[PDB]
Amino acid sequence: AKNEGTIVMVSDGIVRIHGLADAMYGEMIEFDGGLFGMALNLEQDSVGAVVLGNYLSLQEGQKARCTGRVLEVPVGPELLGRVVDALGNPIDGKGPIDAKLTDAVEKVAPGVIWRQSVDQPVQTGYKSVDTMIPVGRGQRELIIGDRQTGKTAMAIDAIIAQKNSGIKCVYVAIGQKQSTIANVVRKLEETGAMAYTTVVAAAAADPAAMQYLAPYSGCTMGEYFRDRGEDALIIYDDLSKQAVAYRQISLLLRRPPGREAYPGDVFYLHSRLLERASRVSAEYVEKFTNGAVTGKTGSLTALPIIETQAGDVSAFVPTNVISITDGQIFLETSLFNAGIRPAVNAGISVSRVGGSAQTKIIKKLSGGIRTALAQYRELAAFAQFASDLDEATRKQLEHGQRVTELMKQKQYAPYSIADQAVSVYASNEGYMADVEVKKIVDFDAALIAYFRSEYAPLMKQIDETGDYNKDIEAAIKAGIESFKATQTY
Amino acid sequence: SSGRIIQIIGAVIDVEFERTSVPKIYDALQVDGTETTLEVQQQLGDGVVRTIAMGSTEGLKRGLTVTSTNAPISVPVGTATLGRIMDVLGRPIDEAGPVATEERLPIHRQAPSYAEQAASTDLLETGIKVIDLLCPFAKGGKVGLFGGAGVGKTVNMMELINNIAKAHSGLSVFAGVGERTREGNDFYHEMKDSNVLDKVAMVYGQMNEPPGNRLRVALTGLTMAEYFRDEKDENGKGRDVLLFVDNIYRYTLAGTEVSALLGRMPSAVGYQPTLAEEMGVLQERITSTKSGSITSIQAVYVPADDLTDPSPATTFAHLDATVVLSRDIASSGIYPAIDPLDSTSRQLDPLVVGQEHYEIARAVQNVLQRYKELKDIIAILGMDELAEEDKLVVYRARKIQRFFSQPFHVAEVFTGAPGKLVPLKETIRGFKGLLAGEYDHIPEQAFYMVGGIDEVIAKAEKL
Amino acid sequence: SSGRIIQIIGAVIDVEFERTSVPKIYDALQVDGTETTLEVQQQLGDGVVRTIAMGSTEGLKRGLTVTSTNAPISVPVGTATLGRIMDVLGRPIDEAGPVATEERLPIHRQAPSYAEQAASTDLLETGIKVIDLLCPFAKGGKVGLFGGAGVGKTVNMMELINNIAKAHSGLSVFAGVGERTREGNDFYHEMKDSNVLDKVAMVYGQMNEPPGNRLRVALTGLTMAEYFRDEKDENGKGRDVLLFVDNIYRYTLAGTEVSALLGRMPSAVGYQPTLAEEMGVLQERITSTKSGSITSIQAVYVPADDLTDPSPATTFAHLDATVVLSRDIASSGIYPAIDPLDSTSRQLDPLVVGQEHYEIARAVQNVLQRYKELKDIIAILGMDELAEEDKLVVYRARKIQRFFSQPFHVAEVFTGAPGKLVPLKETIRGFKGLLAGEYDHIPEQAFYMVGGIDEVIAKAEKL
Numbered sequence A: 001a002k003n004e005g006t007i008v009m010v011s012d013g014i015v016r017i018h019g020l021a022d023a024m025y026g027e028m029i030e031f032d033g034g035l036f037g038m039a040l041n042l043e044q045d046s047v048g049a050v051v052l053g054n055y056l057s058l059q060e061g062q063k064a065r066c067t068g069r070v071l072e073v074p075v076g077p078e079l080l081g082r083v084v085d086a087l088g089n090p091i092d093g094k095g096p097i098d099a100k101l102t103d104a105v106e107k108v109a110p111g112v113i114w115r116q117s118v119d120q121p122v123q124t125g126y127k128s129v130d131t132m133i134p135v136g137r138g139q140r141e142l143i144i145g146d147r148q149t150g151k152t153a154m155a156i157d158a159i160i161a162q163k164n165s166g167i168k169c170v171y172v173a174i175g176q177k178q179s180t181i182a183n184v185v186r187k188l189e190e191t192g193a194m195a196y197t198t199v200v201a202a203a204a205a206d207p208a209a210m211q212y213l214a215p216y217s218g219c220t221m222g223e224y225f226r227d228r229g230e231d232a233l234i235i236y237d238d239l240s241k242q243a244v245a246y247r248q249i250s251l252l253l254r255r256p257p258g259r260e261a262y263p264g265d266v267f268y269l270h271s272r273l274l275e276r277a278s279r280v281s282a283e284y285v286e287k288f289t290n291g292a293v294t295g296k297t298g299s300l301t302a303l304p305i306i307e308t309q310a311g312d313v314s315a316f317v318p319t320n321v322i323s324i325t326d327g328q329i330f331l332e333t334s335l336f337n338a339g340i341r342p343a344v345n346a347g348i349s350v351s352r353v354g355g356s357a358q359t360k361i362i363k364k365l366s367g368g369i370r371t372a373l374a375q376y377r378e379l380a381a382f383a384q385f386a387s388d389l390d391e392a393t394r395k396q397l398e399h400g401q402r403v404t405e406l407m408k409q410k411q412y413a414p415y416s417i418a419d420q421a422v423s424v425y426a427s428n429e430g431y432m433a434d435v436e437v438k439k440i441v442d443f444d445a446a447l448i449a450y451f452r453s454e455y456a457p458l459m460k461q462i463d464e465t466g467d468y469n470k471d472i473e474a475a476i477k478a479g480i481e482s483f484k485a486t487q488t489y
Numbered sequence B, C: 001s002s003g004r005i006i007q008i009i010g011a012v013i014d015v016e017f018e019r020t021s022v023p024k025i026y027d028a029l030q031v032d033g034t035e036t037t038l039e040v041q042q043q044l045g046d047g048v049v050r051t052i053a054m055g056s057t058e059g060l061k062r063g064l065t066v067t068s069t070n071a072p073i074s075v076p077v078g079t080a081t082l083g084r085i086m087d088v089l090g091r092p093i094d095e096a097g098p099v100a101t102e103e104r105l106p107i108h109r110q111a112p113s114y115a116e117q118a119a120s121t122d123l124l125e126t127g128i129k130v131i132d133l134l135c136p137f138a139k140g141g142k143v144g145l146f147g148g149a150g151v152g153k154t155v156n157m158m159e160l161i162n163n164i165a166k167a168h169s170g171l172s173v174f175a176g177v178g179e180r181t182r183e184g185n186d187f188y189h190e191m192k193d194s195n196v197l198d199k200v201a202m203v204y205g206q207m208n209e210p211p212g213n214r215l216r217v218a219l220t221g222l223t224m225a226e227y228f229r230d231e232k233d234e235n236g237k238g239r240d241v242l243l244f245v246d247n248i249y250r251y252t253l254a255g256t257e258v259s260a261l262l263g264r265m266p267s268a269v270g271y272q273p274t275l276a277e278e279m280g281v282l283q284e285r286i287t288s289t290k291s292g293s294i295t296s297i298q299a300v301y302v303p304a305d306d307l308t309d310p311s312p313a314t315t316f317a318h319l320d321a322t323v324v325l326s327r328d329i330a331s332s333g334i335y336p337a338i339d340p341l342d343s344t345s346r347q348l349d350p351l352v353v354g355q356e357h358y359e360i361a362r363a364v365q366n367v368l369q370r371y372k373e374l375k376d377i378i379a380i381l382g383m384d385e386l387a388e389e390d391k392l393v394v395y396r397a398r399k400i401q402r403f404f405s406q407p408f409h410v411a412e413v414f415t416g417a418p419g420k421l422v423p424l425k426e427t428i429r430g431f432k433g434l435l436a437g438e439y440d441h442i443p444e445q446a447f448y449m450v451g452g453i454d455e456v457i458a459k460a461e462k463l
Ligand SMILES: Nc1ncnc2c1ncn2[C@@H]1O[C@H](COP(=O)(O)OP(=O)(O)OP(=O)(O)O)[C@@H](O)[C@H]1O
Pocket: A146, A147, A148, A149, A150, A151, A152, A153, A154, A341, A342, A409, A410, A411, B317, B345, B346, B348, B349
């Protein structure tokens, strides 16, 4: 009698159950037809639950039972190269998934004493991000901008650039139409990056509960690797749509709304999810595996995505995510329409980890880029009055324009650290000051192609080690000066 | 058994049944002694359901009798619906007898799964300069037109129908959701004057109808298009389908009009809390699968000229090509008033359209952005102090926005000038010549309402 | 004598007690079989109270038994809490065994009455020349430290801890109100690496904890600081105690969260009606009394860079000083990286700070302003106009800007832990001499990383 109940009301995906005196918070509930629910409201006389399937087949008078369980998803190195829904059920039609372990969807972050500082780098392949806004293993960096600015391109390029670094990736899609998901999956399979990637899909036609619960299951799938001495990288494509689904669910349950009709605990919703990404110490790994893994640390990096309305970053939702995360990458519509691609705005983009998450050579080299861009920024007003300006100011304008032209890049063309090092070193010493503002991209591409074509051992050494000494600098200068003449663009 | 009406408020009615005969969620009921049909929405307990009438509720009283049908609303499908006009319930309204088929399909169904999805891999030309250059279409994709009141959505839709649907080899479905009756009559007589009435089917629910009809009228046309998509012939392949929807915004507006009477709490600016879910449920059905393809064009209304409003903002993510119309361009006499700095398409990448097209589009957009940047300093200060390159940019940008105007075939009544059709090769030639600087001596008046660059040369010489 | 749960909605729990035994406001309750804690907030009649969970709530059901401890939340206090890390309930989370003490105090207390206020106003020396001259500190006052986007604020806090300790241990207390876990770990590790861990008690409230912890961690830290303040030595006088809260803004954010959860009508922007009440009641316990004093250094994060929002407007009536940091100066090589022009203080009254102090500070600020204005004219024209005028200001403000540099004791990467804790008199004398012109001829590049005038003189005679 304490584990039985009758349905009373059915509307909009919410079911009210009479009875179930032993139901817990978040407990799974089974229905007659094979559908599952989840208790969220424990009132004095009834229970309000959301349906994890489709509710159109449920009618009043049926029976429900409490299972004494919580939400769980399969985990392990078998979901790689697969597409599953929010509950781990495959949807690509490639047969059943044979997993050996399951883990809870709601979990707590590791303690403060079990953590470690972040000093390992993560490469995204973009010159602009890597040399000015570096990202380390265990960091939380936000990508924020307007519609049709290129957030998904940046995330997918970051995923693709992990071909040789050997870190697993997870892609979560919330509230998208299935054609875009299929296109993204096809592009991932084309480049060979599907062998170490998992996709969790919650499309626009799915119930709001699945769209609300998908990121936590993705986070558990990512945490599987962190708890055993490896590294992982998770990406949420839209937290705004998750917030919208949560708002719909909260409003349908008659909870008091606040600013912009959002509930009171949206900040809790995003914070208790984003706090689960960090780096753990070797003692934690030793204790978790009971001595199976001895001398390795684990990490989990997060790349959430937030979309603003007409560049209004003072709304209710984006401010919480901005405050929670460490750094932010801002993309602007005016820069995108003006040809600057990617559209990173260096004025208000920061990385609190800073140079501690960089290789030695890039750390030594990025200072010139930083100072040149700052000096160019210092004279924005008089760009249209070049006739009335100091000659030194004119030269600073020239060098800033050259750097701004250099910072451009194409799509699906990631750069290894050697390419960025060569280009930045060529820019720093003034070899690029004798060409016009145009043809800079052609010059860069030609130089990089030449260096990769005839200087294989040096490129391999820089890629695999990342050291910087007098011999390396001399060899790089010799190659650059050999390209400067006796060659064409 | 049968229930009885216990309360009516506007378009929302609730009925009380016995505890053992409560209908399902999306069932259809009939009121005895009347031509009124009700569709269940919610189950409130104690054998009480809440429904929405599909007609006027005048003359309805508490205590009438209602009988159930134990099925959703079913409409006819097949070739018998070609050349006929039907309402939301599938009844003929063209005074031409009954529909001559027997197959029926429910209007409520689930969307196709993830495994049965296809990739559009074909371009589609239109003859419109700006759309061809800056927002190419794809065969089997989705297109949307965004604009305020009185900016040219209907005219552009009609011109697209004239350019594409006439030279088509297939079928078509046209759905009218909350539009003018005069436009529907004009379109019907225009199609009947020619001999293309045998390839189209029409469903009409307009702005004079109760919210119940406007709520569910798009699903009927969607069901007809779905049946035509998944249709095969013995030793005969499938057929391509064109679908046209007018003001899909009225569907969400009708959903808004009844949200409060159903017992929900408002969100955002007075909107229903289930906006995105009920938009996506309908949007995921308009798609092309492995078995058959659908090409669709929709018109999206922007309330109060606010692109930030929740409805268009939610709609933006369901389309492949987006065309945005602006009142500022329209008020300057430039038609079609398409904003070139806010129109995008997924086909605009060098791997699909080639290098030259991509470079031309990027250069044009860059020039327009630079002119928009310079506008303020040009306005408040003078023009003499500008750099010479800035003057060249200003002149080139003004000529560029002049050259994007084009006289349409369906707009001959308004202006009296014959329409023009431009292949995209001439457009690319003209824009490349314009950006190169070959036409720096032509006055900017010669670029207004012409076809190719040859017409520009002729008009300039005649001047 | 025990109650049972009757309702669980979010983090709000309703417990039904007997009519006679109803726990008072702010009582602490413990569930029987679990390890969760609840705090009473209201009484609703018929033996029903509304509580809040002190942690996670998953794993609870209606019908569990709850017992009352007849007392508010009590935490350990004393010297035994030094060098440890504790949560909002005072339990150790550093894996080092239990805290060895038996003195317990409630975290809910009344502010000191009107007579207990200190009968004088005094200042507090820190060691940093720029913050000792341009932004004087107040003994027992509050410091509003804003500014900084990616700069090293935490190392500055640690160096402030070491500087005050070198002046006088003071038994500082750190309370991170909603701090990043990695930043907290870094702070603890770096304090451990500098042996300053023996004089600091730490309370941590993480970002992912329920908002009640985010509110109450500050109360726990304040209670510990008060107990340290009320400890008297052989002379009979109390200690001066330093308190650190990572962000006051997060405190008000959590207060708004909790108030919105409990179903209250929002305010003009959307905060709670009791913002000023809670902020004042918290802030009225941070005072200097007859025996001992309590100071407060707190980071400020302006909401949306607006000074008209209620969030900083409520706090501005309590901050006794303002300090800002500059990203460019941090990138310019000057380690302290404090912007002088933005950073000001209310303690610059010439009667209390000294007339010479006032004159020197104002003159130095005006000279720096003259340096600031000259850069635009230099960029436009150059120094052709500026001959025998405004150049002297250029060199003087060059050495003035270089003089704010100071090597830092805790930091060992760029210096070997130099003292550099010069008294105020040295700084005022040096600034007076530099303004007068005796050091005008001294090279400007000898002013980098110098503590006193004798040191820069030794440098100048060295080069
Ligand atoms: N570096 C680049 N160079 C050129 N084109 C690019 C670049 N990055 C992105 N694009 C193009 O910009 C367009 C928008 O990219 P994308 O789909 O990633 O944006 P988004 O912000 O995810 O969009 P949405 O508003 O649909 O969420 C696409 O056509 C893409 O090909």
